[PDB]
Amino acid sequence: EAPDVDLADGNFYASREARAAYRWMRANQPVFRDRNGLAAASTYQAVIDAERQPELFSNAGGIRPDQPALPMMIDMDDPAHLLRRKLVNAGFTRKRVKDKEASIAALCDTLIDAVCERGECDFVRDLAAPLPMAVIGDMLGVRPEQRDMFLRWSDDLVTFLSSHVSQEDFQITMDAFAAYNDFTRATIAARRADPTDDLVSVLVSSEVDGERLSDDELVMETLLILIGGDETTRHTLSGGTEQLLRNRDQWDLLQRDPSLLPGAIEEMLRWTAPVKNMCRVLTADTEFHGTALCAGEKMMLLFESANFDEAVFCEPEKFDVQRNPNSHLAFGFGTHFCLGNQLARLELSLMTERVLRRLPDLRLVADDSVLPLRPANFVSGLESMPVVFTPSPPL
Ligand code: HEM
Ligand SMILES: c1ccc(Cc2ccncc2)cc1
């Protein structure tokens, strides 16, 4: 019989029995309906096929199951979406991202310098969460001593998207947005008067076919980037490193052969799938991989389920840094394929290279620990990951 699950309940995604439920879906009802009737594409094939049909599976109803659209690229269809994406793309050209390498590396070394003398840290609190926050904060002009403020606002906003909030938590979300709005409009005004080379400066100057971003659009698109920057990669850093530590043959392989790091990062992404789902709204009734879908309902794309689909990935519960091919869907596919994917990959590579080299005997405090995952229906990963290592002097 079907698993009795609610795919909008954050407790489902904090359960290490989610993957057992996904297995049932893929084998028995690939386009699954949960206990409340919510539709979800569980196979790699169904996710790809929906992604390739944006006119039928739209983003314009919003990408969460129980919330309306916001005025940002991810909640738009082409052609409007393409113009918005092209405008924002000025901040994420291959050259502009690759040029951040030196500054990202410096942040990695500063963060490791803060714990390397101690012999213990919480990998989540001290390395995985702060590095992406510092990178994206630096891009947006956030002072180092205000990073924690922005990360708290970000946590509130992604929690709003990851749940059905109470009235008090709705008020907190609105207050967080108001504070972000205020800060960002001050930045816009300053960069319109004295442009620099930071992200707001590049976005203010971006032009596509005589069109530019308005101040309202700049606020919304930079907020999408802030939350991508500081609520996603952290979970691949923590959960990916956790798999290296739980399978020490994998750790040992990477330490003796740095040319394996690109494939390792892709396997960390496949495994961790920090974005558990994005929704699509049906523009018409349709029969889709055996399940009848109705115009106006939302269907989830289950990216973690796709990433463990045995039709595509041999022995998917084996973590293998050498996996080739590894065409995972952690960043999605198609029109809305993550705009930040290169920056996320660069952060993952640079921090993991340095962790391997500077903390070479890193291990989990309890090798048979089951560590807790964040209850959230949208983005999730490890809450805490205590690790020990031989101390060393800072750089
Ligand atoms: C490992 C980290 C990340 C993961 C797993 C992730 C995942 C995703 C996914 C699944 C989508 C939607 C794709 C679809 O529905 O097919 C998306 C879109 C997007 N992401 Fe990320 N993301 C990450 C990091 C980032 C970062 C660092 C940024 C910016 C600095 C960013 C900016 C965006 C933007 C702007 C979009 C919307 C693109 C569009 O609608 O055309 N993301 N991301
Ligand atoms: C609205 C929609 C999504 C997000 C989170 C998000 C951002 C970038 N890539 C992956 C996830 C925040 C606000």
Author numbering: 3 to 397
Sentences from the paper on this structure:
Fragment 1a was found to have low micromolar binding affinity to both CYP125 (K D = 180 ± 7 μM) and CYP142 (K D = 1.8 ± 2.0 μM); which in addtion to good ligand efficiency (LE = 0.4–0.6), a synthetically tractable chemical structure, and non-azole heme binding group, made 1a a good candidate for structural characterization and hit-to-lead optimization. As CYP125 and CYP142 have a similar biochemical function, ,,, fragment-binding profile, and binding mode to 1a (inferred from UV–vis spectroscopy), we hypothesized that a structure of 1a in complex with CYP142 might provide a suitable surrogate for CYP125, and help guide the development of dual CYP125/CYP142 inhibitors. A 1.7 Å X-ray crystal structure of 1a in complex with CYP142 was obtained by soaking fragment solutions into CYP142 crystals that were prepared by sitting-drop vapor diffusion. Interestingly, the structure revealed two molecules of 1a bound per enzyme active site: one coordinated directly to the heme iron via the pyridine-N (1a-i), and the second located near the entrance of the active site channel (1a-ii). The aligned structures indicated that the binding mode of 1a-i/ii to CYP142 could be accommodated within the conformation of the econazole-bound CYP125 active site, and enabled the identification of key active site residues that differed between CYP125 and CYP142. UV–vis spectroscopy also provided detailed understanding of the binding site and orientation of the fragment hits, which helped guide hit-to-lead optimization chemistry, and enabled us to use the co-crystal structure of 1a in complex with CYP142 as a structural proxy for CYP125. The significant improvement in binding affinity that was achieved through synthetically linking together fragment 1a-i and 1a-ii to yield compound 5m (K D 1a/5m: CYP125 > 1000-fold, CYP142 > 10-fold), illustrates how fragment screening can be used to identify energetic hotspots that may contribute disproportionately to binding affinity.
